[PDB]
Amino acid sequence: MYKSVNITFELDERIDKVLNEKCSAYTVELGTEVNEFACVVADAVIKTLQPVSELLTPLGIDLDEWSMATYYLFDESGEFKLASHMYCSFYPPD
Structure with a gap:
């Protein structure tokens, strides 16, 4: 019922490497809403x-x-779906 998630930050070119290094690892319960x-x-x-x-x-x-x-x-x-590897952006794909 828990999944390890690693995020590649695509929020802002000025700070994504700092976020990738500091706050990219999460444990998430399988039924958690993506929102x-x-x-x-x-x-x-x-x-x-x-x-x-x-x-x-x-x-x-x-x-x-x-x-x-x-x-x-x-x-x-590019689907709004919990995965082991996910992207974080201020903009939806499409």
């Missing part, structure tokens, strides 16, 4: 970036909205 799992990842992303907000501001990143922005999680086939 609920997305909020778990978003929470972890904000916790990871808020401590370096003084570096992000001059890189042109405002974290204000990120907390409430919609995060899209999808699998290698």
